[PDB]
Amino acid sequence: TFYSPKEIFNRLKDSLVPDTGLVTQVWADNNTKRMDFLTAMAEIPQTL
Amino acid sequence: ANKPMQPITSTANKIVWSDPTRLSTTFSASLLRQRVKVGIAELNNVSGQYVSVYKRPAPKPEGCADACVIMPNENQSIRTVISGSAENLATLKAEWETHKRNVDTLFASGNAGLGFLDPTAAIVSSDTT
Amino acid sequence: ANKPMQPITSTANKIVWSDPTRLSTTFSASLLRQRVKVGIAELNNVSGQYVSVYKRPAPKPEGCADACVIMPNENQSIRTVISGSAENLATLKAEWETHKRNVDTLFASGNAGLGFLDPTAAIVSSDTT
Amino acid sequence: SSFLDALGYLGSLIKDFKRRRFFLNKAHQRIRNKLGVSFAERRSQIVSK
Amino acid sequence: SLWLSFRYEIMPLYYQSQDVLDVIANSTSEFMTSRDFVAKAINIGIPLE
């Protein structure tokens, strides 16, 4: 015997949740990327 | 106990483990086998290459805890290389055990990790009286 | 009763130890230190090349003991580097103990010294379940 | 199963392909910039002279 | 003839204008992304009976 497939699907659907730690890590990665882009584009009017 | 890892890239001379929960942490082992000739004796040498990496965001500023401190994540790598003749593995082990204690008294207990070196640190060789 | 060894050459970066009775065997611990600005936080990187070298003669012919038949000495070297920030010796010592255990499982206890590999090695990480 | 394990190296393959593609794109854009600045310098010197 | 003497100034000025437009647009359209993957496990209790 075992659970119903729909029952298992519902349990899994309830269980799924974003990972706060991974979200923070990718968040910091994106922040570093945008800081690098900002300091890189800081020189555009120097070209202008 | 701790979290075991499963190999994710196996090869005859390349096996790499990584933590399923934290895929950043790794442990790589590389073996290079080569035949070397010494005086009237052909020798079968092997070099053991071992790399352990732990990705980690190091210092929490002073002693708080909060969301908007997600400081950069840095790396901590420890690489160990062992070379020696295959049949001398019996004595190869003991000096490796000696190498353990030898660096233990300098880094694990000493301040070598900070950057300081202690001339009067107790250092011993593999052989014993 | 391991033979104690005294420093031979000291420098602003490295110190070498050598056994007075047998000058061949040595141990040196260098140290390169660095300052990095990564996340508006200063991380002091420390990396120390720890090499212990022994020159043991090749094995004498099996089942025969003359008294003195001299073999060419073969090199047994272990190289160890520990690269990390100075703000984490509190935790840099942690995984190094695991790093000890990790290599011991597959090399000291295992037969990786003989050139062999096994993905089924019981590997263990620093993080505790 | 041996094949299933062996298939993973295609990731490194496409990784290196992306390396080559990105380097080629960077080289071409640098060539374009060099050509443009050379043309600007030539125009400036000729018009001044 | 007088009007065709235009190329002198219109051609290179326009060329450099397009050059600066390209060199700003390529940097301006960076479209940065950041991603990560994990293999966290999901546990579902199984009745012992």
Cα angle B72-E25-E23, degrees, rounded to a multiple of 5: 95
Instruction: Indicate yes or no: CB of C59 within 8 angstroms of CB of B88.
Output: yes
Say how many C-beta atoms besides its own lie within 10 A of residue B66's C-beta: 8
Residues of chain C contacting B128 with CB distance shorter than 8 Å: 1-3
d(CA C32, CA E43): 46
Resolution for the entry shown, Å: 3.1
Cα angle B13-B17-B23, degrees, rounded to a multiple of 5: 140
Of the residues E38, E42, E43, the best mutation for testing chain B's interface (the one with the most B CB atoms within 10 Å of its CB) is: E38
| Contacts of A38-47 spanning 24+ positions with Cβ under 8 A | A40/E27, A41/E27, A41/E28, A44/E24, A44/E27, A47/E20, A47/E23, A47/E24
d(CA C49, CA C21): 25
Grouping H, G, I as helix, E, B as strand and the rest as coil, residue C40 is: coil
Cβ pair B70, C100 in contact under 8 A: no
Written as one string, the DSSP assignment of E1-49 is: -TTGGGHHHHHHHHHHHHHHHHHHHHHH---------------------
Confirm or reject contact between C53 and chain B (CB < 8 A): no
Q: What are phi and psi of C70, to 5 degrees?
A: -90, 130
How many CA atoms are closer than 13 Å to the CA of B74, on its beta-carbon side? 22
Residues of chain D contacting E21 with CB distance shorter than 8 Å: none
Grouping H, G, I as helix, E, B as strand and the rest as coil, residue C54 is: strand
Let me know if B106 is exposed, middle or buried by CB neighbors in 10 A (0-12, 13-18, 19+): buried
Q: Which of C74, E4, E48 minimizes the C-alpha distance to B43?
A: C74
- Which method, experimentally, gave rise to this model? cryo-EM
| Start-end of H helices in D1-49 | 2-6, 9-48
Q: What is the DSSP letter of A2?
A: -
Q: What are phi and psi of B31, to 5 degrees?
A: -120, 130
In the block, tokens 């300081």 appear at: B116
* H or E element, residue C53: strand C50-57
In the block, tokens 């390349």 appear at: B14
Q: Which of C100, C115, C114 minimizes the C-alpha distance to B31?
A: C115
d(CA C96, CA C90): 11
Cα angle D9-D14-D15, degrees, rounded to a multiple of 5: 90
Exposure b/e, A38-47, CB count within 10 A at least 16 = b: eeeeeeeeee
Measured over the CA atoms of residue D9, residue D13, residue D15 and residue D19, the dihedral's sign is positive
Of B21, B22, B76, Cβ closest to residue C84: B76
Three-state SS letters, chain B: CCCCCEEEEEECCEEEEECCCCCCCEEEEEEEEEEEEECCEEEEEEEEEEEEEEEECCCCCCCCCCCCCCCCCEEEEEEEEEEEECCCHHHHHHHHHHHHHHHHHHHHCCCCCCCCCCCCCCCEEEEEC
d(CA D36, CA E7): 18
* H or E element, residue C26: strand C26-29
In the block, tokens 């980690």 appear at: B56
For D35, residues 6+ apart whose C-beta sits below 8 A from its C-beta are none
Confirm or reject contact between B57 and chain E (CB < 8 A): no
d(CA B70, CA C74): 51
Q: How many residues does chain D have?
A: 49
Let me know if C3 is exposed, middle or buried by CB neighbors in 10 A (0-12, 13-18, 19+): middle
Residues of chain E contacting D25 with CB distance shorter than 8 Å: none
Instruction: Indicate yes or no: CB of A22 within 8 angstroms of CB of E36.
Output: yes
The C-alpha of C65 sits at a distance from chain B's nearest C-alpha, in angstroms, of 17
